[PDB]
Design a protein around this nucleic acid. Structure first.
Ligand SMILES: [Zn+2]
Lengths: 50, 122, 203, 118, 86, 105
RNA sequence: CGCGACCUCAGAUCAGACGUGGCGACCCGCUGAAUUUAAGCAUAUUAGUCAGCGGAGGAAAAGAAACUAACCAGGAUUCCCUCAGUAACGGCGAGUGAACAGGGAAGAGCCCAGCGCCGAAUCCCCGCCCCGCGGCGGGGCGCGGGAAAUGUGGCGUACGGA
């Protein structure tokens, strides 16, 4: 929808920013257990709700 | 320099604003230097200025408040900021003195018949 | 004094003097709203027995309660079950109408607290009660050592727990062999105590 | 006195203003949207420069709560210039991009060197 | 045609985001939330779903004001005092 | 289904009794709590006796127990009047007083 | 009609304060089933139970007899043992089912209306003084305002009281 409200566009802004992968150096840490981002949302598979 | 809180309290209120906006000014090109690709040494300095701005603005917020509550120290009515905020249930209770109020009938009882200290034998 | 002569004056409700007055107040109270404030007691003698004192902080509200029993709020019969619970017309509410008047007065004026209530008139469809309310934050009530028990947070909404004089009648509590099923805290406490297994360590 | 109209209206009773014996809050809240917080950082995008030498404008990242009037006075106060017009948009990333058109007596290239972007 | 061909006409959202509970359960036509009951002053909760209770209780969120009441409780809620300076 | 020989039993377990089950694991901890509060009370009234005020000599009702003698709620006003002790002063010196008791004997 | 009390009833972004909502393991007041059993099932039983509603507190409620008893009598409320699976209720079927007394834990009593006596002897707010002021507290001054005679305060509550 080209027509948007300020609530939806602000809400869509966070989900776009959360779709980026983890940094390269994050598994150089000491007690880190994260291998990759398990919350990567693809626009074809996961439809985000709404 | 390492801005401390001890020496900031004795300075003038308008002198703090003279220092505050310069810290605000000096932080402005630091965000510019991040976008333009500045040196990594200057990118580690911006957290110090953020905490130094927080230090300056705290003292301005601090020193204003004890001037206000000293001004309202003797008055009957004070703003709700200066009133003690502690757990609304007990702000609705009585004062220190009011449950110490005994009736004239009750005060006669302990004077006429006080509780006695006594002991018994075997 | 004069308070005694009004005590048995209200005990003669069938007399000509009271029957004229009771039908005038009932007409007057009917044209008003279902909830409004009375500025002074119509029954000054009754309020003193219940604990009202004519000072600042003592507030009384006069309301009405619709007369009759309680029918079951169900769609057209809506009793999907055994014939025992098929009764819908001749059911009765567990609490009295006076206790309902204490609940409605306390729910509206939530800042005040209900002391007691009394009867001032009735109709075919309405019962009229004056309900005494106490302001727990007025300095006359707050600084008086006799009346500061209202100010404690334990006595919030006494009429909601049935702790008032009218609400205590429907609880069925009291001393004697007629109140065996309310021994303990309440009716619920008696059933709870009698329906538990005291499984000891050594049995 | 006589009643000309058959309807009864409530008489206009006098009402006072607020005369508090104490303010509700001790001190007024300080302005958190100052001239420094409103302008975050300018853009060094190849489209951002392309907006500069051609249109004689400036591109900034500004807070989402800002007005076009507030951006006009902010750029005026911070850099000692004046602004012809301001066009704003909200990028899907989440903060607000504003195009600041400068007056023809000022040059977008020269003011860029004082503020460091090139 | 009650199956696959009937899902193609789904383009009108009936629910939307609530601004008190955060869940997408605010019915536009009834102007009410099916999760928390937005127009009602009281939060919608029921005892027949204990799992739905513990999804949103006093322990789930930030407790940005309640976590300092517990810290201040163990000192008796002292006010106006400061530790002895150097 | 009953067996050959046995009793007819009425187990009162047809309600949801498993919810209302009162275990007694607090009993060893309760006894310590009763003792510690009792010892703390005694130190508060250190010259006064730990039991409290004295109790009168009381015959039992319910003829099954009518030959037994217990310790009662409090001394009657007739018993205090003969002893020459004012009823409002006896309570301060550790005498249990109640106005409900009678004196038939 | 002018002028002035009083009673009812309004308007306030009036001065000063109060309630809303959350949690809800425990508690109080309502409302309140059907699965199940009775080898069916309808009274019963499940069960004042689940669910629903309101209200608090750190505990709540109850509580100092219009009591229990018929004894040579006990003597506020609450909890444990026992009474007792008893008296009793129940298509007297399934099943349901207390209370007194006794031994313990604890143990604290009291206040009004009315009856009357005291010159309203009473209380709230606003201003001033003094002293602490994060619980504005007390005392003193108010031909300062108000509440209160449609009854405040002291003595005084069944054990008697003046
Ligand atoms: Zn919602």
């Amino acid at each position: 929808s080209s027509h948007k409200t300020f609530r939806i566009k602000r809400f869509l802004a966070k989900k776009q920013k959360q779709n980026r992968p983890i940094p390269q150096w994050i598994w150089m840490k000491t007690g880190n257990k994260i291998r990759y981002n398990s919350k990567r949302r693809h626009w074809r598979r996961t439809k985000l709700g709404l | 320099a390492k801005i401390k809180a001890r020496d900031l309290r004795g300075k003038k209120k308008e002198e703090l604003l003279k220092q505050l906006d310069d810290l605000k000014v000096e932080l402005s090109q630091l965000r510019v230097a991040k976008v333009t690709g500045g040196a990594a040494s200057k990118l580690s300095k911006i957290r110090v200025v953020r905490k130094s701005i927080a230090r300056v603005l705290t003292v301005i917020n601090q020193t204003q408040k004890e001037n206000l509550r000293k001004f309202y120290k003797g008055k009957k009515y004070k703003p709700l900021d200066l009133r003690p905020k502690k757990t609304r249930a007990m702000r609705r209770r009585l004062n220190k003195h009011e449950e110490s109020l005994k009736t004239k009938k009750q005060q006669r009882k302990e004077r006429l018949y006080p509780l006695r200290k006594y002991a018994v034998k075997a | 004094g004069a308070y005694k002569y009004i005590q048995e004056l209200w005990r003669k409700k069938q007399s000509d003097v009271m029957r004229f007055l009771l039908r005038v107040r009932c007409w007057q109270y009917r044209q008003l709203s279902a909830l409004h404030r009375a500025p002074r007691p119509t029954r000054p003698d009754k309020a003193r027995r219940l604990g009202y004192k004519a000072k600042q902080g003592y507030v009384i509200y006069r309301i009405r309660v619709r007369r009759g029993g309680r029918k079951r709020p169900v769609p057209k019969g809506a009793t999907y079950g055994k014939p025992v619970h098929h009764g819908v017309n001749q059911l009765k509410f567990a609490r009295s109408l006076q206790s309902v008047a204490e609940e409605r007065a306390g729910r509206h004026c939530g800042a005040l607290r209900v002391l007691n209530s009394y009867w001032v008139g009735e109709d075919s469809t309405y019962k009229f009660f004056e309900v005494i309310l106490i302001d727990p934050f007025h300095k006359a009530i707050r600084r008086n050592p006799d009346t500061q028990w209202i100010t404690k947070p334990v006595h919030k909404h006494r009429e909601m727990r049935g702790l008032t004089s009218a609400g205590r009648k429907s609880r069925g509590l009291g001393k004697g062999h007629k109140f065996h099923h309310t021994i303990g805290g309440s009716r619920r406490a008696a059933w709870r105590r009698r329906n538990t297994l005291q499984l000891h360590r050594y049995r | 006195k006589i009643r000309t109209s058959p309807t009864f209206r409530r008489p206009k009773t006098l009402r006072l203003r607020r005369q508090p014996k104490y303010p509700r809050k001790s001190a007024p809240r300080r302005n958190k949207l100052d001239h420094y917080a409103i302008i975050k950082f300018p853009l060094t995008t190849e489209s951002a420069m392309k907006k500069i030498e051609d249109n004689n404008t400036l591109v900034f990242i500004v807070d989402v709560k800002a007005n076009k009037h507030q951006i006009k006075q902010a750029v005026k106060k911070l850099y000692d210039i004046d602004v012809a017009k301001v066009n704003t948009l909200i990028r899907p990333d989440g903060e607000k991009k504003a195009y600041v058109r400068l007056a023809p007596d000022y040059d977008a290239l020269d003011v860029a060197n004082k503020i460091g972007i090139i | 045609t009650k199956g696959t061909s009937s899902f193609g006409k789904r383009r009108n959202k009936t629910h939307t985001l609530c601004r008190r509970c955060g869940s997408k359960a605010y019915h536009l036509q009834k102007s009410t939330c099916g999760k928390c009951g937005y127009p009602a002053k009281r939060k919608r909760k029921y005892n027949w779903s204990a799992k739905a209770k513990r999804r949103n209780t006093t322990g789930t969120g930030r407790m940005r004001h309640l976590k300092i009441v517990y810290r201040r409780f163990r000192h008796g809620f002292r006010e106006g005092t400061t530790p002895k300076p150097k | 289904a009953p067996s050959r020989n046995g009793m007819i039993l009425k187990p009162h377990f047809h309600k949801d009794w498993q919810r209302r089950v009162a275990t007694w694991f607090n009993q060893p901890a309760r006894k310590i709590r009763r003792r510690k509060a009792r010892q703390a009370r005694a130190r508060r009234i250190a010259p006064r006796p730990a039991a409290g005020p004295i109790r009168p000599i009381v015959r039992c009702p319910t003829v099954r127990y009518h030959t037994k003698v217990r310790a009662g709620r409090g001394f009657s006003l007739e018993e205090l009047r003969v002893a020459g002790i004012h009823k409002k002063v006896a309570r301060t010196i550790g005498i249990s007083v109640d106005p409900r008791r009678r004196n038939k004997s």
